[PDB]
Point group: D2
Chain length 140, copies 4
Amino acid sequence: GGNLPDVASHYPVAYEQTLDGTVGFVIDEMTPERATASVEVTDTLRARWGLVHGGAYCALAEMLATEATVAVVHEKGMMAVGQSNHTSFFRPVKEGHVRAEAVRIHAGSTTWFWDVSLRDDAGRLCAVSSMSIAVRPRRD
Amino acid sequence: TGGNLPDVASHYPVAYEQTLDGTVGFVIDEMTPERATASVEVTDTLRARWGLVHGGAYCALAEMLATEATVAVVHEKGMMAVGQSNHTSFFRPVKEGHVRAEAVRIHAGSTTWFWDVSLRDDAGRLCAVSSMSIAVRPRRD
Amino acid sequence: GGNLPDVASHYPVAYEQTLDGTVGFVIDEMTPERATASVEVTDTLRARWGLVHGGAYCALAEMLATEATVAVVHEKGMMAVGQSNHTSFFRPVKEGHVRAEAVRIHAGSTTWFWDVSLRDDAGRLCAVSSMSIAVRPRRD
Amino acid sequence: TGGNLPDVASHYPVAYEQTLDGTVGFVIDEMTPERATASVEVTDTLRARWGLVHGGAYCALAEMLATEATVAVVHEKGMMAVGQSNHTSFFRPVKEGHVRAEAVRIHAGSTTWFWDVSLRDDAGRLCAVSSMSIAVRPRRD
Ligand SMILES: CC(C)(COP(=O)(O)OP(=O)(O)OC[C@H]1O[C@@H](n2cnc3c(N)ncnc32)[C@H](O)[C@@H]1OP(=O)(O)O)[C@@H](O)C(=O)NCCC(=O)NCCS
Ligand SMILES: CC(C)(COP(=O)(O)OP(=O)(O)OC[C@H]1O[C@@H](n2cnc3c(N)ncnc32)[C@H](O)[C@@H]1OP(=O)(O)O)[C@@H](O)C(=O)NCCC(=O)NCCS
Ligand SMILES: CC(C)(COP(=O)(O)OP(=O)(O)OC[C@H]1O[C@@H](n2cnc3c(N)ncnc32)[C@H](O)[C@@H]1OP(=O)(O)O)[C@@H](O)C(=O)NCCC(=O)NCCS
Ligand SMILES: CC(C)(COP(=O)(O)OP(=O)(O)OC[C@H]1O[C@@H](n2cnc3c(N)ncnc32)[C@H](O)[C@@H]1OP(=O)(O)O)[C@@H](O)C(=O)NCCC(=O)NCCS
């Protein structure tokens, strides 16, 4: 169900209707320290100029880092949401796939941080994202 | 244009309705060389599974607005403009209504333009900001 | 005492010996929503290439935003420390002064955020800094 | 060189001991086109009034290391390199000892190089990181 971490019996928005399901993000591997996700490039992932939209790398990094945090913290009573996403763009992608790998670099009580690398089908580094995730007690 | 994006060419590789922006519904309202605005109606397509506007939606609305506001000026000077850095910070979530974005240009150099984007809810509250650095380069073809 | 907010009767490091006092940062105005600070350019503020060091704008923004938060929160039992500082550089400064203005844009329970603008003697925008400040209960 | 900064010119505008870097004591240890390291002994000159290493000290050590590691390669190709964006995030404070910085190059484009800088304490713990984007331009004079 994009293979997002199954941590709750109900979610407000079904995968297929979310932004993630609309553009087609799917999680491959997920561990407490490292997660991967990928997407096929389609027009839905593109801006009008034919290259993958800058926002799509941002969103891929956002979901992967946040959900990789959720995977650990939800069962502990916490919620995780993005608090900063800094994405830098090195090389565009016209077609193929975008593959993201998030490596956890800090896991603090209130903040987790993930380095996300976004690669094309040749393995070339096309973008990176520094993802800062706020971790707070779940609300009643 | 589709999405009211600036019309600076006779044709584009991908039509508005098929692009990310048209799929999620981003629309440009005002556009000038120093300030531009855009908005989007929140629907599920804008949300993460947890029911709030997805962090990547604010990133993408900022990305398109700041980049296109640059394109509007530089394209006819033979330049291309593409996001080079997008730093979005999240202050308050949006569950429903609209997200309204205003991009204010703060630096227009020869190789980089920089825009401060504020993303507000229907109550006017500041829900996210994005610092958008846009690379400007001569067009290749 | 660089005119930093007088919120405590003792501080661990005297102004003149801190990084701030060494390079000469001084706060001019401070309110809950807006603060200003300035520095004379000297070699101490410069890199070996003769222009003001990128780190000096970063540090000016860091102290101004953090201390402008401290000014409000210390009396409430909280500590404030920088958690993210993103500085972008638009135009170098060779000599004169650097003047910083921090405008508060969000004041949340756990995070305050300040937009800092760094201007030369002509008023030109030379750098900006997006300052994210963590606010936490003071420790015993 | 003073601070062991790369020696790529016969003279510099400002001597090491008088610059910010020499005042606070930054020293480069290893330097290669893809990886560089530097360190600094914590003393009060590195601290804010509250007694911890000043957030701007990590920013500045990252700024100098990533920029100079670029200079080491591009200067003799007639290019100048200067910080364009420095995004430093703070995970754990340092009260005393040293701060040790390692810059790993992750992109070397024609106009921008990008380095990931990790800043560690004497126990090896990751206390801060900086994403350093460095503009590379032809030298003017
Ligand atoms: C920003 C920050 C408070 C966020 O907390 P976090 O990411 O949830 O990290 P944690 O809360 O897990 O704690 C990590 C370390 O932060 C410090 N810290 C956290 N909360 C603190 C508090 N309320 N008071 C004092 N120090 C605190 C402690 O050194 C802590 O280590 P410890 O728990 O082993 O004592 C913490 O990351 C931090 O202190 N970063 C450094 C800020 C800094 O040095 N900036 C410049 C200072 S001049
Ligand atoms: C990063 C940068 C080179 C990118 O250029 P840009 O965003 O396109 O801005 P512009 O190129 O329009 O020019 C702005 C100023 O940058 C400087 N600059 C730009 N290219 C330069 C070059 N090749 N050599 C020397 N200075 C240059 C000049 O001061 C220029 O002003 P001028 O054109 O009036 O001489 C430029 O923004 C900059 O120099 N920023 C400051 C970097 C800095 O100070 N970091 C710390 C230094 S120790
Ligand atoms: C990151 C964040 C939790 C940090 O908290 P902060 O800067 O200290 O802000 P505050 O804690 O003052 O609270 C501001 C709003 O955040 C939300 N929030 C804060 N803590 C929360 C929690 N534990 N659970 C749920 N929502 C919370 C609430 O909407 C809150 O408003 P309210 O207090 O009027 O209900 C908060 O800024 C935030 O929620 N930002 C948005 C994150 C986001 O939307 N990312 C993408 C989601 S798909
Ligand atoms: C921002 C950027 C232009 C800066 O250039 P840089 O860091 O110096 O990197 P380089 O210029 O060395 O080149 C990297 C790639 O950028 C692209 N590029 C650079 N200049 C270009 C130009 N004038 N026109 C078209 N593409 C260009 C090319 O794909 C280039 O690869 P190539 O040289 O093998 O053709 C470049 O890093 C980039 O294009 N990043 C991607 C931007 C992006 O995809 N954002 C979203 C688009 S919708």
